[PDB]
Design a protein around this ligand. Structure first.
Ligand code: HEM
Length: 106
């Protein structure tokens, strides 16, 4: 999928997690976010199109998805342990990462 479509998928699932009633809904949503983040990681964002693919900026852009995947893994862990509300609260941290990386590259 392209970068924009993967961003919509992340947004779609963040909202599902916020309104979720059970662990399956939260687990499934985090699972789809993780796959979209990994798909997005291979893209070149518009703002960095004139930089080399291996530049410090492109490496930082890719690192933003490694942070996001780590945060999703932490929330997935809690949801799998039946700590649903804790997983939903943990998922809010993804917004900090979104905000910091959007600030830089969106
Ligand atoms: C849960 C985390 C995130 C959410 C919910 C999110 C959501 C979005 C949304 C809704 C858009 C608008 C475009 C569209 O999808 O139609 C967007 C754009 C974008 N996001 Fe994210 N994002 C997240 C994390 C990140 C991270 C971590 C990065 C960088 C590592 C990033 C980089 C970008 C870029 C570069 C654009 C602009 C793409 C373009 O103009 O084609 N996003 N994001």
């Amino acid at each position: 999928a392209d970068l924009e479509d993967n961003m919509e998928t992340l947004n779609d699932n963040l909202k599902v997690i916020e309104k979720a009633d059970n662990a399956a809904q939260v687990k499934d949503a985090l699972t789809k976010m993780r796959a979209a983040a990994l798909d997005a990681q291979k893209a070149t964002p518009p703002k960095l199109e004139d930089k080399s693919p291996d530049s410090p900026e492109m490496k930082d852009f890719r690192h933003g998805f490694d942070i996001l995947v780590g945060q999703i893994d932490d929330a997935l862990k809690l949801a799998n342990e039946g700590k649903v509300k804790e997983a939903q609260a943990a998922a809010e941290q993804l917004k900090t990462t979104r905000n910091a990386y959007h600030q830089k590259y969106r």
